[PDB]
Design a protein around this ligand. Sequence first.
Ligand SMILES: CCCCc1cc(-c2c[nH]c3ncccc23)nc(N)n1
Length: 279
Amino acid sequence: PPQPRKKRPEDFKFGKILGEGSFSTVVLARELATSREYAIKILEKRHIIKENKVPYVTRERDVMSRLDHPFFVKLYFTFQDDEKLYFGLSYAKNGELLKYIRKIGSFDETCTRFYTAEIVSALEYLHGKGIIHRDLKPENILLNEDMHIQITDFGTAKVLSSFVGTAQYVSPELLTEKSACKSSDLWALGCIIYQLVAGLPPFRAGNEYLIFQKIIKLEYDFPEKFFPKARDLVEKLLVLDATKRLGCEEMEGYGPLKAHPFFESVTWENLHQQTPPKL
Ligand SMILES: CCCCc1cc(-c2c[nH]c3ncccc23)nc(N)n1
């Protein structure tokens, strides 16, 4: 199938930096022939080789190519010059969800229900494909123009036939066995639901080590205000035994999770078509 010609850096007007990865920087760019705004992730070939991240960058590019859902960032193109790799990603104008958490303080029952449902729906799609995010957080959950979610950051991701993510969202099994699966994402989800309601992640401490100490002993608690049905859901996600997490294969998958009382009024079938509640 004759696809288009390769794009090149001179086809774009590079603009502001949108972010920084571990071996990359994401730049807002405008395609001149179209006026289209893309978030171009730029990677330096020498640095990637030097740091032994060729399998990292490869996996990332391969995962993003495999994604085809409105709740995930899309990879439109890739090209390369003599020094750099460029990945043309969808641009989420309204930025990260973490900025909203900080701005509005903490979400009401409607917004929490809506944005959690989208995260559940996205994870259901991702996990049905045998992909695992391994680093999910509000920083990774972007918001497009129409205020729907767009998950990004697949560098750290794994495809089902090693690494430890952001300390606050790390699951216990990761801390002990040095292992992960779909259950690691569901733990992270539990942390997110908590942060949406409370305004803060559940396990917080002076340093990485103390955070990790709280995680393994399940040393967290709910504020007085916390919605009971969201409190219940979080309690069925922040479970130490990975096999007892609501939403995993042993717990009979996404059916029982999408069925939790917290999501009674949710119509799962067409979330992308729904108008997001005002924050
Ligand atoms: C760990 C730090 C995240 C930096 C980052 C950002 C993005 C990204 C894709 N589209 C966007 N639109 C707006 C803002 C940011 C983005 N994508 C990746 N892979 N990484």
